[PDB]
Amino acid sequence: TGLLDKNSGSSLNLTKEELELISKIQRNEQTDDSINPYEPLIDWFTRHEEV
Amino acid sequence: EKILQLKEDIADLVTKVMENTAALGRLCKMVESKNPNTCKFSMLALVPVFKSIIPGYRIRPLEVSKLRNFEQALVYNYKNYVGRLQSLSKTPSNAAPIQVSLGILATQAAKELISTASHFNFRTDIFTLLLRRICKPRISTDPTSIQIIQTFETLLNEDEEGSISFEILRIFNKILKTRNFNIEESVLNMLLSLDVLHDYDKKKDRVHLSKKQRKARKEMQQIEEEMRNAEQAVSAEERERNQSEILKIVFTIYLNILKNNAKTLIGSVLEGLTKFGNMANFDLLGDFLEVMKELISDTEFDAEVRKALLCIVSAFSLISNTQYMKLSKFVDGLYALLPYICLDADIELSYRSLRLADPLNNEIIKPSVNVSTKAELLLKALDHVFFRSKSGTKERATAFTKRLYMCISHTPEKTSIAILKFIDKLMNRYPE
Amino acid sequence: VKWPEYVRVQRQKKILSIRLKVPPTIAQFQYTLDRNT
Amino acid sequence: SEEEKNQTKKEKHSRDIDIATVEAMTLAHQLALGQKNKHDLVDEGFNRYTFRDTENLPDWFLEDEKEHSKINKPITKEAAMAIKEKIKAMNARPIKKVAEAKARKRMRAVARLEK
RNA sequence: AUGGUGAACUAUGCCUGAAUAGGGUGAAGCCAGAGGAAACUCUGGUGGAGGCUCGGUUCUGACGUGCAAAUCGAUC
């Protein structure tokens, strides 16, 4: 990362997960997993007919 | 004598293809399994066939003359050809002598191919099939190894733009990263052979053409002029890209050996770091020298005598190689070592331990860090002090003499002759 | 073959109509009433 | 020989992983120095351009989307430094080209005494 | 400073034209003859070719106690 760490004089590196997260921002690729991009439209309002 | 009939059948097929697409496919149908004589007499016979019939333009990127069925014929059959060679030379030492002899002849066929082939995009398979053969901890039963090293050396000698060398050393890096650098020093000599990195520099007899044919000739000449200038610019950029990435590969190979510290490899490591030094980032010169100082200081906590002599000779050779543009711990490195050098019995040793071949042009190529025993390392360190890399120092002249005279008491005969010959040259230099 | 600009555009729009994932308030169309009805 | 094919799965991964742009470099700094954590970037990740299929689609469409799907995030000079330090290769500045650079500037210093 | 008008002032051109002469020596080649076992050389011719001819930066050098009272070696 080219910068120096505050804890120690050694070079501040990045974790595999963070590097994956940066790339997934730049190609947009769904950051928060465990979600469906394509949920069925749950008709929360048309379920009940109007009188 | 079924062999004779098979020899004449294959001979007829050779005379067919050389002078036709189904015949080559039939020749690949010959070598499948279970029949060793057909697996060896035809496989070495297809080599001159491919030597004559391979078009060097990178075939397979997907009218009357088809040139598509012929090229799908050559490529598809060449896949199963080299794939067969893969299954042949993968056989370990615990195998049938027939299968082992098939492996030796297969790598012989492959190394014959590489000198003419490696143009088109089925090269990496053959490169794996020869580098995996070279990169083995035990070589004393393969006669091909020396010759394959020679062919790779020639390959890295003719390669001007760096495409071949980069495609070799990527695969070579993979093998050296899986196996923890168990190499045979001759492979670092083929690393030395890289010429990518260094620079070291009528009117009467005319066939009559039509007006449309002459105008076509003018246009073709102008196209070829553009091809000359464009390929000059492309390869001038390609040389820069290949230098930039090969030097990354070459140096990391070197410094990881300098982690493992194999007793034999260091000589060839510093062969590379002094030849292919001075073409790095010029900020690394101070870093290389600080590494040499570190590798001196490691020996100062106590084989290692060889290593410290190497560090001194390498450093002075590095700065004496700086031809284009315009040293305390190294002279003091010698001034400290001279007791330890003379106190060892291993001053004279031919050094032909695990290295098989003496690489290329050893009469012209002067191995300026590991020339001979250790006697010529003392000679070339002192030569690289008082004749190269200034450091004049009349005080150090008197000090080095007075230590050499407390070294004559601990020397074999030839070494003491050479030392006194250098003292003759110190009487030439410093008359005190 | 070489087609016009607008022909290429409507053919590209046709294949784009198929190959994309579409929101369920659309494609609620094209699931339409059959021939007899 | 299994590791010979299994390590390459990481070697090709860490090419799609490594930073190339200033725009990715800033966000790597913003992580490294404690300004934004994982949780903050996962919020920022939901763009104008999220929830888009990419594998089924023809190339002549995606090559016009990907050119024009770049959100102009603010940069730093601190990031541009490191990304210039990352791209710089080995033969970029040898002894040869240093000596040649001085050979250029000497000719310029001569050309201004030619007048 | 803003807006205009012009430009061989100098480098590199490209297209299309014009001009690129003359006096002298005499290259390659060839012919005849003489030496040379042989190579080759010479004598006499011819032949008409020559950029043929005539109208100051640096070595981080060697000596910052000299090969030098006008320096060497070399680079471009």
XYZ file of C-alpha atoms (C1' of nucleotides) in Angstrom:
711
model
C 0.000 0.000 0.000
C 3.097 2.266 -0.086
C 2.395 3.918 3.277
C 3.881 3.272 6.729
C 1.899 1.702 9.598
C 1.333 3.541 12.911
C 1.771 0.423 15.120
C 5.176 -0.386 13.611
C 7.638 1.020 11.033
C 6.909 -1.999 8.790
C 4.837 -1.518 5.612
C 1.059 -1.651 6.107
C -0.329 -4.512 4.012
C -3.933 -5.444 3.149
C -5.904 -8.628 3.903
C -7.200 -10.871 1.070
C -10.812 -9.989 1.993
C -10.211 -6.212 1.785
C -8.426 -6.519 -1.593
C -11.407 -8.594 -2.801
C -13.740 -5.847 -1.518
C -11.901 -3.038 -3.402
C -12.093 -4.986 -6.699
C -15.786 -5.764 -6.060
C -16.415 -1.999 -5.722
C -14.644 -1.177 -9.017
C -16.435 -3.854 -11.074
C -19.545 -3.228 -8.877
C -19.932 -7.019 -8.189
C -22.378 -7.181 -5.189
C -20.540 -6.081 -1.997
C -22.951 -7.364 0.691
C -23.397 -11.104 0.085
C -26.116 -13.430 1.548
C -28.632 -11.340 -0.447
C -30.468 -12.133 -3.685
C -30.099 -9.572 -6.490
C -33.394 -10.929 -7.862
C -35.994 -11.262 -5.086
C -39.593 -12.147 -6.083
C -41.854 -9.056 -5.875
C -43.743 -9.762 -2.643
C -46.959 -7.804 -3.237
C -47.328 -6.396 0.291
C -50.123 -4.007 -0.792
C -52.172 -5.729 -3.567
C -52.795 -8.826 -1.362
C -55.929 -7.152 0.043
C -58.653 -6.114 -2.420
C -60.333 -2.709 -2.099
C -64.042 -2.497 -1.428
C 11.458 -59.188 -38.431
C 8.095 -57.357 -38.370
C 10.154 -54.224 -37.543
C 11.488 -54.057 -41.152
C 7.957 -54.036 -42.655
C 6.886 -51.335 -40.163
C 10.051 -49.336 -41.020
C 9.100 -49.423 -44.728
C 5.421 -48.557 -44.064
C 6.458 -45.508 -41.979
C 9.116 -44.712 -44.655
C 6.357 -44.689 -47.314
C 4.255 -42.377 -45.099
C 7.288 -40.062 -44.687
C 7.747 -39.941 -48.507
C 4.003 -39.133 -48.745
C 3.875 -36.179 -46.285
C 7.324 -34.676 -47.139
C 6.385 -34.541 -50.853
C -1.534 -35.917 -47.554
C -3.570 -34.804 -44.486
C -4.922 -38.284 -43.614
C -1.372 -39.740 -43.600
C -0.173 -37.543 -40.689
C -3.313 -38.400 -38.665
C -2.556 -42.072 -39.375
C 1.018 -41.486 -38.087
C -0.453 -40.145 -34.823
C -2.780 -43.187 -34.750
C 0.420 -45.311 -34.789
C 1.534 -44.121 -31.328
C -1.152 -44.809 -28.706
C -0.168 -47.669 -26.324
C 1.165 -51.240 -25.829
C 3.368 -51.397 -28.982
C 6.850 -49.982 -28.066
C 8.506 -50.421 -31.505
C 5.773 -48.361 -33.217
C 5.975 -46.001 -30.203
C 9.702 -45.300 -30.861
C 10.559 -45.875 -34.566
C 7.863 -43.457 -35.823
C 8.085 -40.821 -33.036
C 11.711 -40.051 -33.968
C 10.731 -40.264 -37.672
C 8.041 -37.562 -37.298
C 10.749 -35.134 -36.071
C 12.285 -34.435 -39.551
C 8.678 -34.279 -40.876
C 7.828 -31.482 -38.396
C 11.288 -29.881 -38.910
C 10.483 -29.498 -42.628
C 6.711 -28.955 -42.185
C 6.033 -26.329 -39.510
C 5.008 -22.806 -40.578
C 6.535 -20.206 -38.228
C 3.803 -17.547 -38.043
C 1.824 -18.684 -34.939
C -0.586 -21.152 -36.590
C -4.144 -21.726 -35.194
C -5.764 -18.343 -34.466
C -9.037 -19.742 -35.967
C -11.038 -20.624 -53.033
C -9.141 -23.591 -54.566
C -6.394 -23.838 -51.904
C -8.108 -24.687 -48.598
C -5.243 -24.063 -46.087
C -7.754 -24.609 -43.242
C -8.283 -28.385 -43.342
C -4.484 -28.752 -43.718
C -3.894 -26.503 -40.688
C -6.582 -28.131 -38.531
C -4.823 -31.375 -39.550
C -1.352 -30.157 -38.457
C -2.567 -28.538 -35.192
C -5.065 -31.205 -33.985
C -2.553 -34.004 -34.669
C 0.237 -31.963 -32.997
C -1.902 -31.707 -29.819
C -2.057 -35.515 -29.438
C 1.599 -35.717 -30.583
C 2.922 -33.518 -27.732
C 0.240 -34.937 -25.379
C 1.730 -38.372 -26.122
C 5.191 -36.900 -25.353
C 3.717 -35.683 -22.024
C 2.629 -39.227 -21.074
C 6.020 -40.604 -22.239
C 8.485 -38.437 -20.255
C 6.381 -38.300 -17.039
C 7.567 -41.837 -16.117
C 9.620 -41.917 -12.846
C 12.857 -43.883 -12.178
C 10.855 -46.894 -10.902
C 9.627 -48.038 -14.339
C 10.231 -50.641 -17.089
C 13.540 -50.162 -19.050
C 11.487 -50.008 -22.289
C 9.360 -47.135 -20.866
C 12.479 -45.351 -19.521
C 14.196 -45.658 -22.949
C 10.965 -44.274 -24.470
C 11.344 -41.307 -22.077
C 14.981 -40.659 -23.073
C 14.119 -40.837 -26.807
C 10.989 -38.674 -26.245
C 13.023 -35.826 -24.684
C 15.559 -36.298 -27.516
C 12.681 -35.837 -29.990
C 11.440 -32.775 -28.053
C 14.869 -31.060 -27.863
C 15.302 -31.665 -31.614
C 11.871 -30.066 -32.197
C 12.540 -26.943 -30.055
C 15.499 -25.812 -32.241
C 13.141 -25.587 -35.260
C 9.733 -25.239 -33.537
C 8.619 -23.102 -30.509
C 7.304 -20.537 -33.028
C 3.593 -21.439 -32.873
C 1.309 -21.642 -29.815
C 2.067 -25.231 -28.702
C 5.461 -24.404 -27.210
C 4.718 -24.150 -23.447
C 3.931 -27.897 -23.359
C 7.379 -28.790 -24.788
C 9.050 -26.220 -22.477
C 7.442 -27.898 -19.425
C 8.545 -31.303 -20.814
C 12.204 -30.221 -20.856
C 12.453 -27.955 -17.787
C 10.745 -30.592 -15.566
C 13.422 -33.008 -16.846
C 16.266 -30.566 -16.015
C 14.889 -29.450 -12.607
C 15.550 -32.679 -10.676
C 17.727 -33.169 -7.526
C 19.470 -36.212 -9.077
C 21.142 -36.069 -12.508
C 23.679 -38.864 -13.138
C 21.588 -41.223 -15.324
C 20.272 -38.820 -18.012
C 22.615 -38.217 -21.008
C 20.091 -35.748 -22.521
C 20.329 -33.174 -19.671
C 23.655 -31.637 -20.831
C 22.288 -31.290 -24.394
C 18.910 -29.813 -23.281
C 20.845 -27.201 -21.228
C 22.807 -26.437 -24.444
C 19.603 -26.015 -26.519
C 18.042 -23.655 -23.936
C 21.327 -21.684 -23.945
C 21.170 -21.285 -27.753
C 17.458 -20.331 -27.471
C 18.361 -17.508 -25.060
C 21.147 -16.387 -27.386
C 19.139 -15.839 -30.570
C 16.135 -14.292 -28.738
C 16.442 -10.554 -29.467
C 13.026 -9.131 -28.459
C 12.482 -11.233 -25.306
C 9.226 -13.103 -26.039
C 10.839 -16.579 -25.951
C 12.866 -15.906 -22.763
C 9.833 -14.590 -20.851
C 7.751 -17.636 -21.874
C 10.572 -19.921 -20.656
C 11.242 -18.195 -17.310
C 7.556 -18.004 -16.282
C 7.291 -21.833 -16.424
C 10.802 -22.067 -14.907
C 9.668 -19.830 -12.008
C 6.663 -22.138 -11.351
C 8.960 -25.188 -11.049
C 11.424 -23.312 -8.788
C 8.540 -22.188 -6.517
C 7.010 -25.673 -6.074
C 10.392 -27.332 -5.419
C 12.343 -25.343 -2.799
C 15.266 -24.435 -5.128
C 16.962 -27.811 -5.611
C 18.859 -26.791 -8.761
C 22.054 -28.112 -10.422
C 24.073 -24.864 -11.105
C 24.194 -25.589 -14.876
C 20.624 -24.237 -14.952
C 21.937 -20.923 -13.583
C 24.526 -21.032 -16.398
C 21.622 -21.154 -18.877
C 20.296 -18.181 -16.881
C 23.606 -16.462 -17.786
C 23.087 -17.031 -21.540
C 20.280 -14.393 -21.759
C 21.200 -11.884 -24.505
C 17.877 -10.052 -23.969
C 19.271 -8.259 -20.906
C 22.747 -7.052 -22.002
C 23.684 -4.818 -24.974
C 27.427 -5.273 -25.816
C 27.313 -2.645 -28.636
C 20.633 -4.856 -62.070
C 19.008 -3.085 -65.056
C 19.666 -5.805 -67.680
C 18.430 -8.768 -65.608
C 14.822 -7.745 -64.929
C 11.763 -9.976 -65.270
C 9.164 -7.892 -67.134
C 6.106 -6.893 -65.106
C 2.751 -5.441 -66.214
C 1.658 -1.867 -65.369
C -0.873 -3.204 -62.819
C 1.802 -5.608 -61.520
C 4.388 -2.799 -61.118
C 1.832 -0.601 -59.317
C 1.038 -3.599 -57.084
C 4.800 -3.898 -56.428
C 5.045 -0.206 -55.397
C 2.098 -0.614 -52.986
C 3.547 -3.847 -51.517
C 6.889 -2.072 -50.944
C 5.098 0.765 -49.097
C 3.164 -1.746 -46.927
C 6.475 -3.504 -46.112
C 8.057 -0.118 -45.243
C 5.261 0.413 -42.683
C 5.806 -3.157 -41.408
C 9.546 -2.462 -40.920
C 9.036 0.771 -38.934
C 6.034 -0.519 -36.922
C 7.768 -3.790 -35.918
C 10.881 -1.770 -34.998
C 8.748 0.351 -32.634
C 6.787 -2.669 -31.298
C 9.907 -4.795 -30.578
C 11.672 -1.738 -29.048
C 8.754 -1.533 -26.586
C 8.641 -5.351 -26.238
C 12.358 -5.433 -25.309
C 11.637 -2.887 -22.540
C 8.610 -4.878 -21.235
C 10.526 -8.171 -21.347
C 13.608 -6.697 -19.619
C 11.304 -5.205 -16.940
C 9.569 -8.509 -16.105
C 12.441 -10.973 -16.735
C 14.703 -8.988 -14.340
C 11.887 -9.313 -11.764
C 11.826 -13.097 -12.360
C 15.652 -13.508 -12.511
C 16.380 -11.524 -9.305
C 13.672 -13.173 -7.137
C 15.004 -16.563 -8.290
C 18.467 -15.367 -7.153
C 17.560 -13.865 -3.756
C 15.407 -16.868 -2.738
C 18.466 -19.092 -3.337
C 20.254 -16.540 -1.111
C 17.592 -17.399 1.503
C 18.115 -21.194 1.283
C 21.948 -20.906 1.086
C 22.942 -23.930 -1.007
C 26.748 -24.299 -0.785
C 27.313 -24.715 -4.557
C 24.772 -22.294 -6.074
C 26.124 -18.980 -4.619
C 28.935 -18.806 -7.238
C 26.428 -18.895 -10.104
C 24.011 -16.579 -8.225
C 26.727 -13.894 -8.105
C 27.648 -14.665 -11.732
C 24.135 -13.395 -12.506
C 23.977 -10.537 -9.972
C 27.175 -9.009 -11.468
C 26.388 -9.591 -15.161
C 22.672 -8.684 -14.942
C 23.380 -6.003 -12.364
C 23.957 -2.446 -13.688
C 20.775 -2.969 -15.765
C 18.502 -2.733 -12.712
C 16.897 0.465 -11.328
C 20.216 2.187 -10.270
C 18.642 2.690 -6.824
C 19.304 -1.032 -6.331
C 23.113 -0.646 -6.670
C 23.304 0.630 -3.079
C 20.836 -2.127 -2.131
C 22.882 -4.876 -3.872
C 26.074 -3.676 -2.146
C 24.294 -3.535 1.249
C 23.210 -7.149 0.575
C 26.876 -8.035 -0.126
C 27.854 -6.330 3.165
C 25.099 -8.330 4.926
C 26.353 -11.612 3.395
C 29.845 -10.676 4.643
C 28.511 -9.945 8.175
C 26.773 -13.373 8.292
C 30.183 -15.099 7.963
C 31.534 -12.885 10.800
C 29.496 -14.845 13.395
C 31.867 -17.846 13.055
C 32.425 -23.208 3.043
C 31.642 -19.720 4.428
C 35.169 -18.623 3.383
C 34.120 -19.281 -0.247
C 30.967 -17.155 0.310
C 32.858 -14.132 1.720
C 35.479 -14.280 -1.072
C 32.555 -14.325 -3.525
C 31.054 -11.192 -1.885
C 34.323 -9.239 -2.243
C 35.080 -10.289 -5.867
C 31.419 -9.689 -6.877
C 31.256 -6.148 -5.416
C 34.418 -4.951 -7.184
C 33.344 -6.617 -10.455
C 29.951 -4.830 -10.167
C 31.465 -1.325 -9.933
C 34.089 -2.166 -12.612
C 31.234 -3.163 -14.992
C 29.617 0.327 -14.813
C 30.728 1.245 -18.352
C 28.271 4.032 -19.250
C 28.150 6.342 -16.192
C 30.691 7.488 -13.545
C 34.139 0.434 -0.786
C 35.447 0.247 2.793
C 33.886 -2.962 4.201
C 35.135 -4.992 1.197
C 38.827 -4.000 1.332
C 38.494 -4.440 5.130
C 36.689 -7.693 4.226
C 39.952 -8.954 2.691
C 42.071 -7.419 5.496
C 40.025 -9.452 8.020
C 39.704 -12.682 5.970
C 43.392 -13.293 5.095
C 44.050 -15.298 8.309
C 40.928 -17.494 7.677
C 41.854 -18.015 3.979
C 45.354 -19.377 4.733
C 44.177 -21.379 7.785
C 42.011 -23.596 5.509
C 43.229 -26.643 3.553
C 40.580 -26.193 0.814
C 42.441 -23.436 -1.124
C 42.936 -25.645 -4.217
C 39.866 -27.553 -5.457
C 38.908 -27.842 -9.161
C 35.175 -27.235 -8.435
C 33.387 -29.585 -10.861
C 31.096 -31.046 -8.164
C 27.466 -30.983 -9.415
C 27.801 -28.834 -12.563
C 27.687 -30.953 -15.734
C 28.478 -28.537 -18.583
C 30.869 -25.609 -18.912
C 28.173 -23.373 -20.520
C 29.082 -21.548 -23.787
C 32.263 -19.724 -24.823
C 34.440 -20.298 -21.733
C 37.557 -19.224 -23.678
C 35.987 -15.778 -24.358
C 33.516 -15.677 -21.411
C 35.667 -14.935 -18.350
C 33.664 -16.054 -15.238
C 34.750 -12.967 -13.268
C 33.413 -14.080 -9.825
C 34.095 -17.872 -9.714
C 37.000 -18.451 -12.169
C 38.709 -21.507 -10.599
C 39.607 -22.791 -7.091
C 40.017 -20.010 -4.466
C 43.630 -19.114 -5.364
C 42.357 -17.135 -8.372
C 39.702 -15.602 -6.072
C 42.511 -14.118 -3.934
C 44.280 -13.108 -7.160
C 41.171 -11.476 -8.692
C 40.122 -9.781 -5.417
C 43.591 -8.208 -5.105
C 43.581 -7.389 -8.861
C 40.127 -5.803 -8.385
C 41.618 -3.668 -5.556
C 45.045 -2.449 -6.782
C 44.388 -2.451 -10.569
C 40.613 -1.974 -10.798
C 38.342 0.182 -8.557
C 41.095 2.662 -7.508
C 41.391 2.590 -3.652
C 45.097 3.530 -4.121
C 46.085 3.542 -0.441
C 49.870 3.207 0.052
C 49.108 2.415 3.720
C 46.933 -0.577 2.704
C 49.674 -1.640 0.246
C 52.108 -2.006 3.184
C 49.418 -3.702 5.334
C 48.398 -6.264 2.660
C 52.060 -7.194 2.002
C 52.753 -7.737 5.746
C 49.689 -10.037 5.940
C 50.666 -11.980 2.774
C 54.085 -12.695 4.342
C 52.191 -14.102 7.349
C 50.312 -16.201 4.760
C 53.304 -17.663 2.842
C 53.785 -19.800 6.002
C 50.279 -21.267 5.376
C 50.111 -21.945 1.597
C 50.359 -24.728 -1.001
C 53.098 -24.213 -3.637
C 51.154 -22.861 -6.674
C 49.283 -20.292 -4.528
C 52.530 -18.906 -3.050
C 53.979 -18.554 -6.590
C 50.946 -16.471 -7.655
C 50.949 -14.361 -4.441
C 54.646 -13.513 -5.000
C 53.829 -12.662 -8.645
C 51.259 -10.159 -7.316
C 53.908 -8.785 -4.902
C 56.085 -8.319 -8.041
C 53.207 -6.200 -9.414
C 53.054 -4.309 -6.078
C 56.763 -3.527 -6.543
C 55.672 -2.255 -9.977
C 52.904 -0.122 -8.413
C 54.206 0.955 -4.970
C 58.063 1.155 -4.902
C 58.156 1.425 -1.063
C -23.495 -9.147 -44.697
C -23.739 -5.430 -43.831
C -26.987 -3.974 -42.475
C -28.086 -0.321 -41.912
C -27.669 1.546 -38.598
C -31.333 1.384 -37.480
C -31.725 -2.285 -38.516
C -28.682 -3.231 -36.428
C -30.100 -1.133 -33.547
C -33.520 -2.882 -33.490
C -31.905 -6.337 -33.828
C -29.521 -5.446 -30.968
C -32.525 -4.217 -28.949
C -34.318 -7.527 -29.704
C -31.453 -9.668 -28.326
C -31.108 -7.183 -25.403
C -34.811 -7.754 -24.646
C -34.040 -11.470 -24.133
C -30.562 -11.676 -22.584
C -30.950 -9.289 -19.614
C -32.488 -10.193 -16.273
C -35.717 -8.151 -16.055
C -37.754 -6.773 -13.032
C -40.986 -8.755 -12.315
C -43.394 -5.826 -12.897
C -42.155 -6.096 -16.493
C -42.123 -9.717 -17.841
C -45.519 -9.734 -16.133
C -46.166 -8.703 -19.729
C -45.223 -11.279 -22.450
C -46.825 -13.840 -20.092
C -49.921 -12.960 -22.075
C -53.364 -14.295 -23.085
C -53.295 -17.249 -25.523
C -54.745 -17.459 -29.069
C -58.235 -18.870 -28.349
C -59.050 -16.550 -25.433
C 2.422 -32.024 -9.474
C -0.984 -31.069 -7.976
C 0.478 -27.965 -6.264
C 1.963 -27.041 -9.679
C -1.681 -26.558 -10.792
C -3.141 -25.429 -7.415
C -0.734 -22.542 -6.648
C -1.477 -21.044 -10.103
C -5.118 -20.658 -8.954
C -3.734 -18.157 -6.390
C -1.176 -16.678 -8.837
C -3.945 -15.783 -11.335
C -6.237 -14.659 -8.481
C -3.645 -12.139 -7.200
C -3.622 -10.524 -10.677
C -7.366 -9.776 -10.515
C -6.702 -8.668 -6.910
C -3.715 -6.268 -7.216
C -4.357 -2.516 -7.434
C -3.902 -0.848 -10.842
C -5.786 2.482 -10.607
C -5.488 5.674 -8.514
C -9.235 5.240 -7.801
C -8.643 1.802 -6.218
C -5.482 3.049 -4.479
C -7.232 5.833 -2.537
C -9.788 3.348 -1.174
C -6.904 1.044 -0.178
C -5.378 3.985 1.754
C -8.772 4.860 3.287
C -8.762 1.277 4.614
C -5.075 1.115 5.628
C -5.118 4.352 7.617
C -8.265 4.148 9.774
C -10.744 6.326 7.876
C -13.058 3.684 6.404
C -13.504 0.118 7.635
C -15.030 -2.879 5.773
C -18.554 -1.944 6.964
C -18.306 1.588 5.500
C -17.230 0.390 2.028
C -19.990 -2.251 1.912
C -22.425 0.720 2.234
C -20.594 2.684 -0.516
C -20.536 -0.430 -2.734
C -24.259 -0.104 -3.539
C -23.981 2.332 -6.441
C -26.125 3.605 -9.313
C -24.700 0.580 -11.131
C -25.318 -2.404 -8.796
C -27.563 -5.435 -9.514
C -26.331 -5.936 -13.085
C -25.838 -9.262 -14.870
C -22.530 -9.515 -16.784
C -21.967 -13.153 -17.871
C -24.963 -13.810 -20.167
C -24.646 -10.510 -22.068
C -22.971 -9.994 -25.495
C -19.593 -8.243 -25.560
C -20.619 -5.377 -27.912
C -23.010 -4.198 -25.155
C -20.731 -4.631 -22.103
C -17.820 -2.862 -23.848
C -20.075 0.230 -24.043
C -21.374 -0.095 -20.465
C -17.962 -0.631 -18.770
C -16.489 2.453 -20.491
C -19.288 4.578 -19.039
C -19.859 2.900 -15.640
C -17.161 4.711 -13.633
C -18.202 6.774 -10.621
C -15.800 9.705 -10.193
C -14.701 9.234 -6.582
C -12.306 11.834 -5.037
C -8.553 11.067 -5.118
C -5.422 12.076 -3.162
C -1.808 12.942 -4.072
C -0.792 10.397 -1.385
C -2.332 7.585 -3.489
C -0.926 8.787 -6.843
C 2.568 8.634 -5.282
C 2.279 4.929 -4.368
C 0.618 3.903 -7.662
C 3.551 5.540 -9.522
C 5.858 3.605 -7.160
C 3.938 0.393 -7.968
C 4.030 0.591 -11.800
C 7.744 1.599 -12.084
C 9.630 -1.462 -13.353
C 13.303 -2.537 -13.170
C 14.832 -1.272 -16.441
C 13.005 2.087 -16.056
C 16.179 3.847 -14.878
C 19.422 1.899 -15.554
C 23.019 3.238 -15.652
C 22.739 3.448 -19.477
C 19.705 5.784 -19.528
C 21.104 7.898 -16.641
C 24.367 8.465 -18.581
C 22.292 9.141 -21.729
C 20.154 11.688 -19.816
C 23.313 13.610 -18.863
C 24.446 13.218 -22.504
C 21.206 15.011 -23.493
C 21.593 17.861 -20.966
C 25.260 18.455 -21.879
C 24.167 18.929 -25.526
C 21.534 21.450 -24.343
C 24.168 23.315 -22.270
C 26.339 23.419 -25.435
C 23.426 24.600 -27.659
C 22.942 27.640 -25.365
C 26.547 28.742 -25.959
C 26.146 28.314 -29.742
C 24.284 31.668 -29.758
C -2.939 41.935 -21.436
C -7.050 41.077 -25.384
C -7.976 40.617 -30.190
C -6.138 40.526 -35.088
C -2.281 40.834 -39.753
C 1.736 38.712 -41.632
C 6.151 35.490 -41.849
C 12.435 31.059 -45.848
C 13.958 33.592 -39.681
C 15.594 28.988 -39.269
C 15.669 22.780 -39.480
C 13.261 18.602 -42.107
C 10.944 17.725 -46.284
C 7.675 16.154 -50.662
C 5.666 16.893 -55.903
C 6.666 18.763 -60.582
C 10.093 21.333 -63.967
C 15.029 23.407 -65.525
C 20.430 22.881 -64.786
C 24.323 19.086 -62.947
C 29.430 21.607 -68.138
C 34.918 21.735 -69.457
C 40.710 20.902 -69.035
C 44.222 17.190 -66.850
C 45.659 12.592 -64.603
C 43.771 7.382 -66.059
C 40.140 2.905 -61.531
C 37.531 -1.890 -62.701
C 37.536 -4.853 -66.974
C 39.613 -6.726 -71.687
C 43.734 -7.620 -75.753
C 48.890 -8.401 -77.231
C 53.928 -9.644 -75.216
C 57.917 -11.022 -71.373
C 59.528 -13.311 -66.633
C 57.276 -17.058 -63.123
C 57.006 -25.389 -62.668
C 52.716 -22.759 -60.471
C 50.709 -18.401 -58.118
C 51.413 -13.834 -59.570
C 54.305 -9.700 -61.565
C 56.102 -6.488 -65.186
C 56.129 -3.947 -70.848
C 52.896 -2.054 -74.396
C 47.830 -1.093 -75.802
C 42.515 -0.401 -75.129
C 38.848 0.920 -71.671
C 36.489 5.515 -69.353
C 35.680 4.996 -63.012
C 37.189 8.390 -58.991
C 33.723 13.127 -51.950
C 40.919 12.439 -57.741
C 42.462 17.381 -59.476
C 42.450 22.422 -61.943
C 40.350 26.761 -63.282
C 34.885 21.480 -28.356
C 32.250 18.873 -24.672
C 33.949 14.542 -21.537
C 36.647 10.572 -18.904
C 34.482 12.104 -11.974
C 41.526 8.587 -16.551
C 47.128 9.137 -16.712
C 50.682 13.828 -13.498
C 45.880 18.115 -8.939
C 54.736 16.365 -6.133
C 53.974 15.982 -15.028
C 55.839 11.969 -21.529
C 54.005 18.430 -21.306
C 57.018 26.296 -20.824
C 52.014 24.693 -25.206
C 50.514 16.992 -22.497
C 48.882 11.885 -23.871
C 45.082 8.013 -24.943
C 40.190 7.966 -26.582
C 34.715 9.129 -26.866
C 31.412 11.744 -29.531
